[PDB]
């Protein structure tokens, strides 16, 4: 038959991200001598909306320790940060909302965001509006730290890995119903063209495993193996259980 919707996506044509209006990538500071041995202070000069995001960014300006000039970075804004607030980043930084510290230097229970999964990664985990990771332990041999991601998953990362004390701004955005179709239209219009979503069951056979039939029904189990191929991964991929989640 034909190429399914999903398959089309990968070539990225009309299916690339809508990148034009975005302010730029959100990234932590480069991991310089400063950040590794002491702290460096910056100022959030403005907090600003990024289109495809649900969380505002903070433009924070730093002084280059190696060259005369100010340099502007793009952080994700933690809740409670404000314009003209001072941000401190480094091994020997103090533990306040907004600052950026190695996970090793925060007592357990601390709440962090924009976490690097390896050191230097410029921040990778807990970025979406509302989310945070919690420090749940530091190994007695040191070196690693144990964190709990918004999913529930526990992961062990390097203590040298950086993070930002506090929670990401714009929380509870998902609490409000997207009452109208058009408001969702507007939302995805700034991400990528994954809206309208036709049901495979509403398609013809050429178009989808689910396609066709006199009655509009799936016709076969809709749980597909991990070891399926491109046009078979169409329903509930690799589903370990199904039905209303009781656990």
């Amino acid at each position: 038959g034909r190429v399914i919707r999903g398959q089309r996506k990968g070539r990225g044509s009309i299916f690339k991200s809508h990148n034009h209006h975005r302010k730029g990538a959100a990234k932590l500071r480069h991991l310089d001598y400063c950040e590794k041995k002491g702290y460096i202070k910056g100022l959030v000069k403005d907090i600003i909306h990024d289109p495809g995001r649900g969380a505002p960014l903070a433009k924070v300006i730093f002084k280059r320790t190696e060259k005369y000039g100010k340099k502007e970075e793009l952080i994700i804004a933690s809740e409670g940060m404000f314009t003209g607030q001072y941000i401190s980043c480094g091994t020997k930084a103090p533990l306040s909302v907004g600052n950026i510290l190695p996970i090793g230097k925060m007592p357990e229970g601390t709440l962090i965001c924009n976490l690097e999964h390896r050191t230097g990664n410029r921040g990778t985990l807990v970025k979406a509006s509302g989310c945070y990771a919690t420090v749940v332990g530091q190994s007695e041999d040191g070196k690693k730290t144990k964190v709990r991601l918004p999913s529930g998953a526990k992961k062990t990362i390097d203590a040298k890995a950086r993070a930002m004390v506090g929670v990401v701004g714009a929380g509870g955005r998902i609490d409000k119903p997207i009452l109208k179709a058009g408001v969702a239209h507007h939302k995805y219009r700034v991400k990528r063209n994954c809206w309208p979503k036709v049901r495979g069951v509403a398609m013809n056979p050429v178009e989808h495993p689910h396609g066709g039939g006199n009655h509009q029904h799936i016709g076969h189990p809709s749980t597909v193996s991990r070891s399926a191929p491109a046009g078979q991964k169409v329903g509930l991929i690799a589903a370990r259980r199904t039905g209303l989640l009781r656990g």
């Binding site: 907090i47 505002p56 409670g80 506090g166 929670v167 701004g169 955005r173």
Partner: protein, 85 residues
């Protein structure tokens, strides 16, 4: 004369949209549109500009907050913990 009894701010939506959904929107709308107390000037002038941005008409200071309320409880808790530490 007070126009709506239970509807309030959701009078713009009218008859359409589930009533339950409208009720929820109402709370959220209220949260959004209330002039919050600015923790700098003191004047209740902080209003929502974007999703997580809250600007004051007094200071022009943009404070990062929650999507609908200026402070989500979790964030407050986190702050408190930090303070205690």
């Amino acid at each position: 004369s007070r126009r709506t009894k239970k509807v309030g701010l959701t009078g713009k939506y009218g008859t359409r949209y589930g009533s339950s959904l409208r009720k929820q929107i109402k709370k959220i709308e209220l949260m959004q549109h209330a002039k919050y107390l600015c923790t700098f000037c003191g004047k209740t002038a902080t209003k929502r500009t974007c999703v997580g941005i809250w600007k004051c008409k007094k200071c022009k200071r943009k404070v990062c907050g929650g999507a609908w309320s200026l402070t989500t409880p979790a964030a407050v808790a986190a702050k408190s913990t930090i303070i205690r530490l």
